[PDB]
Each structure stands twice: as structure tokens, then as C-alpha cells.
């Protein structure tokens, strides 16, 4: 089903895409998986702890 949604998305079915290094411009020698992950910021902040 994720493969299907990626097909309307227009793929790669695996979910890996060619990625270029911002410093060089050279492509990374392998395909790299990229996607939107949901990430949370935890209550531990350097400002409080240092």
C-alpha cells in the first residue's frame, strides 16, 4: 500500500533517492532513503542543564 502511495507520489518504490552533497555537488555513491519523519523536541534543553 505504501508502494502504491509512492506510485501516485511517483516513486522510488524502495523510498531511496539520489542525493547530492551540498559542499561538493558530487552525488553520494549510493541511493539514499529520504522521507518526512515526525520528530519531537524533548524537555531536556542545554540552556536548563548547563
Amino acid at each position: 500500500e505504501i508502494k502504491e502511495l509512492l506510485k501516485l507520489g511517483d516513486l522510488p518504490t524502495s523510498g531511496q533517492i539520489r542525493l547530492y552533497d551540498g559542499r561538493t555537488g558530487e552525488q553520494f555513491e549510493r541511493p539514499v532513503t529520504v522521507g518526512y519523519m515526525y520528530m519531537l523536541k524533548l524537555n531536556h534543553l542545554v540552556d536548563d542543564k548547563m
Binding site: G22, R23, T24, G25, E26
Partner: protein, 298 residues
């Protein structure tokens, strides 16, 4: 000894008002990625642009306040103002006035039309006034600068995070160029997605200009400090301060040189003011008619 072929802007395909495709006609193979990366790196961070840096909303003191008659709180409003796309003629600071009363959305089109200032997206929502007795009056300060300068990088006046860079996204393609001559030539196709504040061609020439300027070759305690403090540090009355400044006395060192006789000869200084000055100077171990001989060093 084969002379090189030098790049020239040859095409501009405006896909939209804020999306363009600039291509360089002549390039030697392997030069596509070099200029592609150099230009993408300059464009994505070193471009100069106008951005909202301060905002003065009526009735509001701190940004955490919420206003009577406005749907969104002030924070959301400022957050909206960050996205205000402004093109200014020839200035490094401009004040925009926004007066609006009524019901409905308060967009950038309601901002008072200034001759210099050009508003890229007039339909850009800044507010939403709900009731018909509601009204907002704010002063938006727009400045020219470089890169991302947060408000935390330091009056009842609010500050807004500055996003100066006009460029959102850059992409490039190396693509083999035609032309029977040489055959091994490429053409750099830069797909640019900016905010519409600046035209593609001048952006390219500016990135290249910055690059060229970077490549500019390869070569190879005596005396009391209190005397250089401004008169405002004496914390005098407004009248005395203004009088002293009017008499070309801007620092304590200037004041301690003057005598009572000379000061009383001024058009605006009475006995009360002199008493005050002598009092505040004596309170810090200073006085009038002080000789420091050597005014000033450097």
C-alpha cells in the same frame, strides 16, 4: 595553449513570477558542477534582501499580548510579517504605515502605498479583523541586509526575526550543450525559486560578483576613562543636557574644562542648572574648571 570559452547568460525562462531558469551557453566539460555549486552556495545565503525587522502595533506592548477584535494573537501577526515580501527602490530602511478598520482580512494591499516601496504579494494576509468596531494601526520597519539575523541578535516596540535572503531554493543541471564547434561543451541550467524580490539575471551577476571579489588573488594609558563618557551618563535634567549639547559639550571631558563664568555666559543656563551640574559632578569626584591638558589624544 588552447584559449578557454567563457560563460555568458543566454536564456531566461520565467516559469512564473518567482520561478526562473537561467542558462549559460558556453562551458567546458567539468565546469558545470563547479559553477553550479559555487553559485548555489552564494545564492542560498549571500544574497541581499529586504525584510521586516521591527513592528510597532498600537495598544500592544509585548508580543505575547492579544488584541481586542483580532482573531490571531500578536505572535501570529509578527510571524505573518516575517513573510512580508517587499521590494524597496533605493533605501536601506523604510517605514510602512498600516491603518485598517472594518471586518475581514487585513492584507498587504491595505498598507499605505509608498512611492519607493513595491509590494510583491498584495494578497498576503497580515491580519483578520472580526467585528466592525475593530481597527489596527501599525508601523512596519523594513530593512536591507544579508543572511538570517534572528531577533535575539540585539521600548514597547516589538522585534521580528529577520529572513533577509530573497532565495528559497536553487537547483542546477549540467546538460550537454549543442553547437558543432568543439562538441565537448556544456550549458549550466540554474532553476531558481526566489520570493520575487529580485530578478534572476542580477542575482546571477551578483553571485558571480561576490565570487570574483572573494578570489581577489593570493598575496604574501593614563588619564581617567570617565572623561570620554557621554554627558547622558551624568544623568542631568533634559534642559541642562540639551543646553550643554547646544554649547558643543557632548562629553564629561568637555564639561570639566568649562568654568562657572563661561557657563553663565551661555544663552540658556541659569543658576539652578549650574547648581545641578556642580552637584552631579561633585557627587562623582569631579568639578568645573578641571584641567586635563591634552584635549584630545586621538
Amino acid at each position: 595553449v588552447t584559449e578557454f570559452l567563457k560563460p555568458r547568460l543566454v536564456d531566461i525562462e520565467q516559469v512564473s513570477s518567482t520561478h526562473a531558469k537561467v542558462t549559460l551557453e558556453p562551458l567546458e566539460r567539468g565546469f558545470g558542477h563547479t559553477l553550479g555549486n559555487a553559485l548555489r552556495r552564494i545564492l542560498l545565503s549571500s544574497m541581499p534582501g529586504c525584510a521586516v525587522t521591527e513592528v510597532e502595533i498600537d495598544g500592544v506592548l509585548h508580543e505575547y499580548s492579544t488584541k481586542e477584535g483580532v482573531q490571531e494573537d500578536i505572535l501570529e501577526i509578527l510571524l505573518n510579517l516575517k513573510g512580508l515580501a517587499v521590494r524597496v527602490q533605493g533605501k536601506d530602511e523604510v517605514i510602512l504605515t498600516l491603518n485598517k478598520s472594518g471586518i475581514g482580512p487585513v492584507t498587504a494591499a491595505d498598507i499605505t502605498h509608498d512611492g519607493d516601496v513595491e509590494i510583491v504579494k498584495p494578497q498576503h494576509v497580515i491580519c483578520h479583523l472580526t467585528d466592525e468596531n475593530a481597527s489596527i494601526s501599525m508601523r512596519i520597519k523594513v530593512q536591507r541586509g544579508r543572511g538570517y539575523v534572528p531577533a535575539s541578535t540585539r521600548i514597547g516596540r516589538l522585534l521580528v526575526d529577520a529572513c533577509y535572503s530573497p532565495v528559497e531554493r536553487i537547483a542546477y543541471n549540467v546538460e550537454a550543450a549543442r553547437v558543432e564547434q568543439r562538441t565537448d561543451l556544456d550549458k549550466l541550467v540554474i532553476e531558481m525559486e526566489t520570493n520575487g524580490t529580485i530578478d534572476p539575471e542580477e542575482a546571477i551577476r551578483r553571485a558571480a560578483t561576490i565570487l570574483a571579489e572573494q578570489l581577489e588573488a593570493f598575496v604574501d594609558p593614563e588619564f581617567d576613562p570617565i572623561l570620554l563618557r557621554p554627558v547622558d551618563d551624568l544623568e542631568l535634567t533634559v534642559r541642562s543636557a540639551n543646553c550643554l549639547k547646544a554649547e558643543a559639550i557632548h562629553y564629561i571631558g568637555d564639561l570639566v574644562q568649562r568654568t562657572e563664568v563661561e557657563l553663565l555666559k551661555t544663552p540658556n543656563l541659569g543658576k539652578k542648572s549650574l547648581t545641578e551640574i556642580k552637584d552631579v559632578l561633585a557627587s562623582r569626584g569631579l568639578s568645573l574648571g578641571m584641567r586635563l591638558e591634552n584635549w584630545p589624544p586621538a
